[PDB]
């Protein structure tokens, strides 16, 4: 049960994402009911995948370094913390693309914290989206899932059990055990254990 539901439980977490695609082309921010505009990837199709756990374990950063230096599109896969940025100016400043040089510098992936943009009317600078003609884009996407909606039909169940019972532990407490007088105790052969009397 736990193994089959692992991926669903993990993707329900609000503090880790399932990866980050670095695509050095400009990709439109997706329109999601939970965020507004969000640089969210539904899947990793079309990108080379580098497993961050394997990269951490090996310590060989030659491929990741070569790809980051040469601006080679890639998908870094692994449970990652992310920064939720609601600032339109941050998106215009392209700060989501500035978070991967520390991988090359430190040869570490435990501090990689990609930016997840959440641009909506609650943003202080949302007018920039509303009052101007342009498509909000970013070069990075965060591989994360959307929460499952609550459905009453799919959640209402009937749980069945017994009305009541009593569980007992000491069964031999229910046995009344007596013994014959030791003078009369017999052995397997039906004669007295001690016959010298």
């Amino acid at each position: 049960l736990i193994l089959m539901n692992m991926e669903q439980i993990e993707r329900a977490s609000d503090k880790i994402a399932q990866g980050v695609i670095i695509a050095y082309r400009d990709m439109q921010l997706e329109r999601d009911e939970m965020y507004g505009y969000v640089n969210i990837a539904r899947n990793l199709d079309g990108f080379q995948q580098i497993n961050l756990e394997e990269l951490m374990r090996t310590g060989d950063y030659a491929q990741i370094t070569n790809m980051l230096l040469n601006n080679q599109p890639v998908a870094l896969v692994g449970a990652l913390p992310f920064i939720t940025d609601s600032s339109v100016i941050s998106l215009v400043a392209k700060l989501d693309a500035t978070v991967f040089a520390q991988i090359v510098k430190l040869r570490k992936v435990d501090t990689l914290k990609p930016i997840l943009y959440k641009i909506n009317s609650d943003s202080n600078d949302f007018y920039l989206v509303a009052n101007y003609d342009w498509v909000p884009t970013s070069t990075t996407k965060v591989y994360k899932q959307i929460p499952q909606q609550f459905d009453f039909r799919a959640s209402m169940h009937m749980l069945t059990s017994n009305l009541t019972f009593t569980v007992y532990s000491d069964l031999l407490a229910f046995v009344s055990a007596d013994t014959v007088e030791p003078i009369n105790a017999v052995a397997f052969d039906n004669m007295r254990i001690m016959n010298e009397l």
Binding site: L1, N5, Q8, I9, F152, A154, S155, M156, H157, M158, L159, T160, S161, T164, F165, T166, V167, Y168, S169, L171, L172, F174, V175, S176, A177, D178, T179, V180, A185, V186, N190
Partner: protein, 98 residues
Amino acid sequence: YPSILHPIDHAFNEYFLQHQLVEPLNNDIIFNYIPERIRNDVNYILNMDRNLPSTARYIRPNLLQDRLNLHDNFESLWDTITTSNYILARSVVPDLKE
């Protein structure tokens, strides 16, 4: 009873409900719980002076024999096991009289 549960939560709770460890308990089960050679020994009189309701339950002990075969190639562990068994047996052996 009606319940609201996430499908994973329902899976867990339904597994708990469907696979409970309690079995019906009756006087036949208790009688067979007694070792068979003590039930046949005429020096011991065993009686069932208790009434068990149909709502009685118990959990069967897992008396599976040794899957680790600790008697084979575990000299120190087997020494410890036999020492503990020896101490317990000493505790239960009767005292001589007269």
